[PDB]
């Protein structure tokens, strides 16, 4: 698409804008559906979780969120079939991007005299992804774990804030299989 480098909003530098009522004119959020795959089970049929956990606190765009998500899902259908595992996107894009828009072409751009100043027209939105956040949570079953790991790997090149694949465990997968069946 049309150029914007991700560096512009990469720094967590500005005040956080998620107040819709003051921040008028915010355009379309970009992920169609956050949960792709199953959504009739959680951990019951998926006694393995893999996470992609943030190494660097930086604001990842909605555009980059889509890119990572779609690549991961496409691997799922191409290597494990349509109704394989379950991908969840787990962070949502609160932070409205203003940013400088609408340049001119005299021998100045930046209309007033060279400000420019606030009152920036909205360009899009980002999710603020801080360190240790789970951007993508893909639940899996342990035998087929390597497929999910591979899917996350293709995804990870497609956001500005570096993340590290990790085998995630909640109540273990060995504390669940105790606590459940003592109160059941």
């Amino acid at each position: 698409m049309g150029r914007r480098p991700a560096r512009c909003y990469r720094q967590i530098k500005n005040k956080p804008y998620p107040k819709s009522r003051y921040c008028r004119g915010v355009p379309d959020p970009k992920i169609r559906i956050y949960d792709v795959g199953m959504k009739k089970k959680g951990v019951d049929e998926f006694p393995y979780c893999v996470h992609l956990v943030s190494w660097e606190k930086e604001n990842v765009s909605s555009e980059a969120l889509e890119a990572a998500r779609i690549a991961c899902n496409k691997y799922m259908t191409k290597n494990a079939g349509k109704d394989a595992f379950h991908l969840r996107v787990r962070v949502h894009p609160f932070h409205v991007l203003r940013i400088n828009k609408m340049l001119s072409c005299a021998g100045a751009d930046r209309l007033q005299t060279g400000m420019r100043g606030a009152f920036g027209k909205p360009q899009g939105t980002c999710a603020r992804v801080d360190i240790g956040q789970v951007l993508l949570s893909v639940r899996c079953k342990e035998s087929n774990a390597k497929h999910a790991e591979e899917a996350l790997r293709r995804a990870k090149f497609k956001f500005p804030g570096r993340q590290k694949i990790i085998h995630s465990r909640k109540w273990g997968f060995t504390k669940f299989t105790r606590e459940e069946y003592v109160k059941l």
């Binding site: 019951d44 669940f176 459940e180 109160k183 059941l184």
Partner: protein, 304 residues
Amino acid sequence: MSLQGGFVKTQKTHAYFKRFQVKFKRRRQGKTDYRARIRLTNQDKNKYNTPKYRFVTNKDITAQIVYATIAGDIVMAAAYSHELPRYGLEVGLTNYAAAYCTGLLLARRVLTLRGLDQEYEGNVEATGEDYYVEPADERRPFRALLDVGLIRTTTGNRVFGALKGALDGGLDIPHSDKRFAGFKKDEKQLDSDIHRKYIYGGHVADYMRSMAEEEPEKFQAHFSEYLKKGIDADGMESLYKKVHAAIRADPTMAKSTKKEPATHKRYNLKKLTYEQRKASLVERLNALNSSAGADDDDEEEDDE
């Protein structure tokens, strides 16, 4: 199943709830309006609290002259219409004549020359008098303000009848005569201001005599004898009584008033845990049960 109110509170819990600590305990009981109370308390003038509807009524009325302090109030005198038959009275204890005599009694009691603080010149202990306009102790009515409480200011009330007895007792309430239960409400004379009908001690006298059932103890005239009686100067009674018995009250109270839990709580829990494993139905309140595993905790593990 549905349900609202209960459901709408428990979901949003804390948000209501704390609603009872918006206002406090006195209001919760229905005792003290803080919008009324605040006005009185700045200059610390005594509350001449005289209830007569939805407090104590239809058996007795009472007039207490009450001073405030910061650790809580402290009555400087009290008197009950229930203590009025000690001085003789057997006509209704809910009437104006009873209220008037309670006011006379209270005014005599509040000093009784006690302690340092007096004023018995002027004339505190105001004579047996046929009224017209507020008799005080010169120029200055002080230290008693008619506290109706939460009850309405309505002309022809027992509260204003008590106020008349305060004035003719030597207590000096601030006043205006445009809502007062006038002169002849004691039974006396009237015929003035906005107020109408002269009689209210002698209300009853017409009422009963047009036949119908009402109080025993005779007849129309009988008010006047005990109207006179509370004016007299033999103050300083209210009964010697037999005191307590042992450990607070009674076996009925011993069964009624205190606790159980600590030890008892563990037994009910033990019974409940046994019941859960013996049947499996509901762990109590609104769901669960499929062996269980003790307490509220179970639900979180019984998810996956």
